[PDB]
């Protein structure tokens, strides 16, 4: 008959919105969020939302920006108690190196000495220490790298850099939606959606050109990008298998220290015991060979058949983006990935045991590529061994060719937000709106 306005409250309707999510962790000193975080839900509840086709868009996901800002802020807070090395910027005369040497790139290791300050304002002390070539620039007389651009802070020796899984949880009135659909490319409608109070834990792993210790694709290698036609964009590749990599530093370095001023001390590399050798990483050849074949097959689906796919090392740019960054034992390594990407594919096999890559060590680093800031890592005593799994790749189109039967890819990197996206693409945040109206016929007495 006559339809009337009715009011309902508690109606299950939501709208897209951004809100701050709060971190939680199962985790004693560490640079990571564990100090800011609260205890986790050990078994987060998941409720499937049936008959829901909610759209996801990882490229517009603001959770990425929140994660990035929190990680940087935490990194900085961990350094505020730590020792400043301003007195360290000195003449640094160097005398080459003497030992039982199998060496490295020639001149990679340097023996240097200087006048360092002491506990009393009235006195100075003569010291010597070893430096890597990357740490020192010639003015013989030398200058510590970046003394002419920034202050250098020593990382605290007692604080771990080991990744800690971080969970993110919604505030009341908000919910986190998760896409369960297999082989999702990160955009468009998701066929299967569920609601969780919190995300699965995400580790703050930092690496370049290759993604380490991330999640694996459930069935097949997944290739995604913001704009497949734009050569500028990075292409993220998620593997459905791990590839194990064995990295080591054989040199048996020793550690010595000097008290500087009343409140602080400086740590430096001492004499090296035994033969001096190049740092390196071992990747299984058979495993890598299979892995590339899986990636190539998926590339062909996107770029079509009848294409010759070639891989190559980066053509240029700084060490920070042209090599693979690691953090193992607190030492920072830069490894040359050439030989992993050195191939051409035609017949679903290459046209042509293990692969060993050379690595370099640098003590002066800038993790977020910020201008005017730098950190000095302390030396780690003894031999380092580190084994990890490669879980994905960052590739860019180099040739971009449409005028030929060929295409060439090279490793990408330098933008950390793309690492965060490899885990966060699954999630979306929405706001709950409980109020609504309907026509149902009814009346109310006055």
């Amino acid at each position: 008959e006559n339809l009337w306005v009715t009011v309902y409250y508690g109606v299950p309707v939501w709208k897209d919105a951004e809100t701050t999510l709060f971190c939680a962790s199962d985790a004693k000193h560490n640079v990571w969020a564990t100090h800011a975080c609260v205890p986790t839900d050990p078994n987060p509840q998941e409720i499937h939302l049936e008959n829901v086709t909610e759209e996801f868009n990882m490229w517009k996901n603001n959770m990425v920006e929140q994660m990035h800002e929190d990680i940087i802020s935490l990194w900085d807070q961990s350094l505020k108690p730590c020792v400043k090395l301003t007195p360290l910027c000195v003449t640094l005369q160097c005398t080459n190196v003497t030992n039982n040497i199998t060496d490295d790139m020639r001149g990679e290791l340097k023996n240097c000495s200087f006048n360092m300050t002491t506990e009393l304002r009235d006195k100075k002390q003569k010291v010597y220490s070893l430096f890597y070539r990357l740490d020192v620039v010639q003015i013989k007389e030398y200058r510590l790298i970046n003394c002419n651009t920034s202050a250098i802070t020593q990382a605290c020796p007692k604080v771990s850099f080991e990744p800690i899984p971080i969970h993110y949880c919604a505030p009341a009135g908000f919910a986190i939606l998760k896409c369960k659909d297999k082989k999702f490319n990160g955009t468009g409608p998701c066929p299967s959606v569920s609601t969780v109070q919190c995300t699965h834990g995400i580790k703050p792993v930092v690496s370049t050109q290759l993604l380490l210790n991330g999640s694996l694709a459930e069935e097949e290698v997944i290739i995604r990008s913001e704009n497949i036609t734009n050569n500028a964009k990075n292409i993220l590749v998620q593997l459905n298998t791990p590839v194990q990599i064995n990295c080591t530093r054989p040199n048996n370095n020793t550690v010595k220290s000097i008290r500087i001023g009343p409140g602080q001390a400086f740590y430096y590399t001492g004499d090296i015991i035994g033969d001096i050798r190049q740092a390196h990483c071992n990747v299984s050849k058979a495993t890598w060979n299979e892995t590339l074949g899986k990636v190539v097959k998926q590339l062909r689906k996107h770029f079509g058949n009848n294409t010759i796919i070639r891989f190559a090392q980066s053509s240029g740019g700084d060490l920070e983006v042209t090599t693979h960054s690691f953090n193992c034992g607190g030492e920072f390594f830069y490894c040359n990935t050439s030989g992993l990407f050195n191939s051409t594919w035609i017949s679903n096999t290459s046209v042509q045991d293990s692969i060993t890559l050379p690595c370099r060590i640098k003590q002066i680093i800038n993790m977020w590529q910020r201008i005017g800031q730098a950190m000095y890592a302390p030396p780690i005593q003894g031999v380092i061994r580190c084994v990890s799994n490669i879980t994905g790749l960052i590739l860019t189109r180099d040739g971009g060719s449409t005028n030929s039967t060929t295409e060439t890819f090279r490793p990408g990197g330098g933008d950390m937000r793309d690492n965060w996206r490899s885990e966060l693409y699954k999630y979306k945040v929405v706001k709950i709106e409980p109020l609504g109206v309907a026509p149902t016929r009814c009346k109310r007495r006055v």
Partner: antibody
Amino acid sequence: EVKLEESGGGLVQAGGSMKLSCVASGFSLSNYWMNWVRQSPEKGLEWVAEIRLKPQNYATHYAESVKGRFSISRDDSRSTVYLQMNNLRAEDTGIYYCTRPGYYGHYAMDYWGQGTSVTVS
Amino acid sequence: DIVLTQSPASLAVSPGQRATISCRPSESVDNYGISFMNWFQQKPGQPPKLLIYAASNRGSGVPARFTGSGSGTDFSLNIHPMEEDDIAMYFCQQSKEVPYTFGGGTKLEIK
């Protein structure tokens, strides 16, 4: 079993226009490159057009002998390929074929449709 | 454009004898150490069929009697034994560059 079916052929007055079509079957069109060729006993085989996939921004290429009078386009949602032509010349008379590049890195016309006659006068 | 020369215009071959057809690209088909010449067979009323790819690899369903040969700018097709079933036009193709080009369409017949 891959099949290609041509249609839209027939006699057209010179200076006129027509559209040829090819229906893909047995394979995913969106995952594959497509090509057109033509034949006449006077000339033998001649390549006329190629069309690329989305990452390639659907770029197209033409033989100089047909460029600017011919256009190639595809509809991935209907599994079809079209060859549009205008400003037709008697020189364009021949048998047109829908083709597929086949073997990888060894581009070759592994599959052909039956083709269709086109006559211009 | 790359010019693909093919000869003879035609040849008659007696049954059981070897046929030979040659092609001379103005620029080599070779790339990545691999030849890019294709060979096709055609009979009246039918579309061309691929016999050889990469100037040496027989296609699916192709009998042993057909073989490719050569490198650089000098390639040839050798058919043996010749049979009536092999009567056809034969074409070379250069797949290395756009535009793709075709050969002379040499006629092979029984003598």
